[PDB]
Amino acid sequence: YSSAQRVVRNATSNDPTGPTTFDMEEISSFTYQSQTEFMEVMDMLDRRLNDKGKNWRHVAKSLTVLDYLVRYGSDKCVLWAKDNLYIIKTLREFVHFDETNNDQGAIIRVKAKELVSLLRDDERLKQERANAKKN
Ligand SMILES: [Cl-]
Ligand SMILES: [Cl-]
Ligand SMILES: [Cl-]
Ligand SMILES: [Cl-]
């Protein structure tokens, strides 16, 4: 793994805490570097979004990072998310009952539904990204 990949993995691990704001700022900064590094970041989010069951936090945290990247990361992040809208839409139905039979999947479904809606709302996203760049 590259350094950027280790950070993305750290920020999307099973640890029930995180990612932090600094974690997401760091990952966002990685998307403004080489195309190779940008692709390494998105590929690792892609890999985490494919996890299931007990590893549900990998999916929830990766959706958190991805929503942050669509608003603060490079424009290529928005392009990746739109090109891969299928993945995000599929996660709107994610299910995972834990040991006490609580469906921790609700967290993932909400985040996926919210991200699909943000990607749909092109003008809203444009103005939110412009405000981020303004600052
Ligand atoms: Cl982990
Ligand atoms: Cl898994
Ligand atoms: Cl940009
Ligand atoms: Cl809506």
Residue 42 CA, ligand 3 centroid: distance in Å: 15
- Which CATH number is 110's domain given? 1.25.40.90
Task: Say how far apart CA 11 and CA 15 lie, in whole Å.
Answer: 9
Distance 29 CA to ligand 1 centre (A): 23
Ligand 3 center to 133 CA (angstroms): 9
Pull the structure tokens for residue 110.
Answer: 């909400």
The Cα 31–Cα 80 span in angstroms is: 11
Residues 6+ apart with CB under 8 A from 26: 7
CA pair distance 38, 27, nearest whole angstrom:
9
* C-alpha distance across the termini of the chain, in Å: 32
DSSP the chain: --HHHHHHHHHTSSSSS---HHHHHHHHHHTTS-HHHHHHHHHHHHHHHT--GGGHHHHHHHHHHHHHHHHHS-HHHHHHHHHTHHHHHHGGG---B-TTS-BTHHHHHHHHHHHHHHHH-HHHHHHHHHHHHH-
CA distance 61 to 19: 7
Ligand nearest to the CA of 116: 4
For ligand 3, the distance from its centroid to the CA atom of residue 76, given in whole angstroms, is: 7
Using N-to-C axis directions, what is the helix angle for 21-30 and 56-72, rounded to 10°? Answer: 60
Gap from CA of 48 to ligand 1 centroid (Å): 10
**What is the tally of structural domains in the chain?**
1
CA of residue 27 to ligand 1 center, whole Å: 17
Q: Cα(14) to centroid of ligand 2, in Å? A: 11
Q: Can you give the residue range of the structural domain that contains 4?
A: 1-135
Ligand number with the minimum distance to the CA of 115: 4
